[model samples]
Target: EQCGRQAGGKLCPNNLCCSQWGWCGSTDEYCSPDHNCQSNCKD
Candidate 1:
């Protein structure tokens, strides 16, 4: 159940780690579907 709980809280996005997986970006923040940054989350 990788369902992002923080997502519905307006925290994470779709194409992001929270959605794609439990990955985190180097932005010191949550990921997003913007720009199609990463279909596969990679920290």
Candidate 2:
């Protein structure tokens, strides 16, 4: 499965973190807290 993709209205699965570039990942790049935890982030 995929997430963060606006094409199909994707939005992560199993509490996975969504990236700013419309992608799913668990790394700091995707779940970054740089902005103090946004809706698109999970870590």
List lDDT for all candidates, in order: 0.39, 0.61
Clashes of each: 0, 0
**TM-score for candidate 2:** 0.54
TM-scores of the candidates are: 0.18, 0.54
Error of 1 at 19 (Å): 5.3
**Candidate 1, 1-43: lDDT as tens digits:** 2334424323334444444443434342334454232334344
RMSD of 2: 3.7
Candidate 2 per-residue lDDT, tens place, 1-37, comes to 3554453657776676766665666778778877332
How many steric overlaps does candidate 2 have? Answer: 0
Residue 17 accuracy (lDDT) in model 2 = 73
Model number with the top TM-score: 2
Candidate 2 collision pairs: none
